[PDB]
Ligand binder design. Structure first.
Ligand SMILES: *[C@@H]1O[C@H](CO)[C@@H](O[C@@H]2O[C@H](CO)[C@@H](O[C@@H]3O[C@H](CO)[C@@H](O)[C@H](O)[C@@H]3O)[C@H](O)[C@H]2NC(C)=O)[C@H](O)[C@H]1NC(C)=O
Ligand SMILES: *[C@@H]1O[C@H](CO)[C@@H](O[C@@H]2O[C@H](CO)[C@@H](O)[C@H](O)[C@H]2NC(C)=O)[C@H](O)[C@H]1NC(C)=O
Ligand SMILES: *[C@H]1O[C@H](CO)[C@@H](O)[C@H](O)[C@H]1NC(C)=O
Lengths: 271, 274
């Protein structure tokens, strides 16, 4: 455990600018399912994992299955299962994602297969990217049944109600975003059998689902490891044990702050 | 076939770059390619075959040091793969090399995703190790920097000269009217409101191509990029279309040399209940 050095220069207002809600609905070959709601600069705030109850964080409203945004997700779970069942003929994850300006809700929808975009729709242009064989023996006509996704009437009927709720949620997220309350770790001695080489681990634990970018730099800054949040953030750098000192870790948030940790001579001595 | 050559560039201008791509699969399939910065591969080898190239170029000579550098990397990647990769997938090592000044960049890709890189001063690992390796980042870093480019630097100017001539022959070979273009419906035989319009282009010129098939309203499109099947160039795109709106579906092909080819599904072409 290590104490953060908080560089706040380049701080942004996460609740500033136009509001955007991101609805992500995924399915794998196993039958694993996910439904998530995020904001523009956040990871998942409300989620449902393999058909469980809507889950969230202790700094926000309890997640309610009767909320019109979650009813939207549940309808999509159904849609994606039917979708998955005709089209998908090789194993892999299918992701349908709505990017929704609020209070309209003229949404963009992206379809990803194994992380790649196979289709999209901005309500003006439908796009199919030509890679079908990769994941199906069915043709573009089948695919185009699903391209537009589901109607968003549930969202637009309650458009304003949804807005004031997620403005409230973002405001709670901003209040919870306290960099000094996250937990920070700088572990060495991960290669116990290697006499000359070691791995330096940097980890952060948080209950705030902002996007995080973690870089572990070597002493000379000629070697780095990069991780992104997925809520644990962890990254691992191979290092020479005689150059473990001054190896740093830098973490930047989606709210604009930057934490740096340093492997000090205090920590070298105790090792 | 409606060719537009406004904006055509000189693909052999600016500083030259050679791109060396070397791949291995779990089943032991392999690929080694050389391309310029604005092309797909010009020389390639597939599953250990002899170098293959195009009708317009020098016969691919296996004794060329650039090609020896590819075979040398075949050995590197086999060793790399054996002790790093513990789950099925394609590993690609890619050198981006300025010529004649061979201060190269190297990228590593697993399943199409970048896992490691070394540019000038800085080695980068992206921490996704525990998805392709049971082993540790200290194993990886044995391979990050790749091979010494000594085969390339020893022969720097000869390579520059050879590839300057290959680039000119390619630039000369790039002749849109000598490519083969097809625009075709009647793919969906048992469909009442729907058809598929297929746009295809066959070429011996390994430029990068971007293909869009547009509906009559420019409100629906299919996009295909030229894919490189090892000295084999596929550009094919398929657009689902309402049969009643098939007229004026247009296909639009753009090359990395700057030209665009439009193919329109014309009134004349609709006249056909064959
Ligand atoms: C969803 O609806 C919003 C509006 O409610 C659309 O946003 C608007 O998009 C237009 C066209 O891109 C923007 O107009 C542009 O404005 C810039 C800056 O002033 C100007 O220089 C450009 O020439 C252009 O006219 C407009 O700013 C923007 N409005 C707002 C309030 O954001 C959006 O495009 C819709 N999205 C979808 C997926 O349909
Ligand atoms: C389909 O596209 C063709 C080609 O653009 C259209 O033909 C044009 O029609 C206008 C009006 O008569 C003329 O000004 C152009 O000179 C024509 N172009 C050519 C090349 O013949 C045609 O109008 C379109 N068809 C439909 C049904 O809209
Ligand atoms: C190496 O070549 C020269 C050195 O001055 C420079 O222009 C270039 O940025 C370098 N290239 C890379 C990618 O290492």
């Amino acid at each position: 455990v290590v104490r953060p050095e908080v560089n706040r220069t380049g701080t942004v207002d996460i609740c500033q600018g136009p509001m955007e809600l991101i609805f992500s609905v995924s399915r794998t070959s196993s039958g694993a399912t996910g439904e998530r709601i995020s904001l523009k600069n956040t990871l998942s705030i409300v989620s449902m994992e393999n058909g469980g109850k809507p889950g969230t964080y202790e700094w926000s409203f309890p997640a309610n299955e009767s909320w019109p945004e979650i009813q939207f997700l549940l309808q999509n779970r159904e849609f994606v299962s039917k979708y998955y069942a005709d089209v998908v003929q090789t194993p892999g994850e299918l992701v349908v994602e709505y990017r929704c300006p609020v209070p309209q809700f003229n949404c963009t929808i992206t379809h990803r297969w194994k992380g790649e975009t196979i289709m999209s729709f901005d309500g003006a242009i439908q796009t199919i990217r030509s890679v079908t064989s990769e994941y199906t023996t069915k043709n573009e006509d089948t695919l185009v049944k699903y391209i537009r996704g589901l109607n968003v009437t549930l969202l637009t009927d309650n458009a304003k109600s949804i807005e004031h709720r997620w403005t409230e949620i973002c405001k709670k997220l901003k209040d919870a975003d306290r960099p000094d309350d996250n937990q920070y770790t700088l572990e060495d001695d991960i290669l116990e059998d290697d006499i000359e080489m070691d791995i330096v681990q940097c980890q952060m634990t948080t209950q705030v689902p902002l996007k995080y970018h973690m870089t572990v730099w070597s002493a000379g800054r000629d070697s780095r490891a990069i991780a992104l949040s997925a809520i644990e953030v962890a990254s691992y750098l191979p290092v020479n044990r005689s150059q473990i000192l001054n190896t740093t870790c830098e973490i930047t948030s989606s709210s604009g702050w930057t934490v740096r940790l340093r492997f000090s001579e205090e920590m070298v001595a105790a090792s």
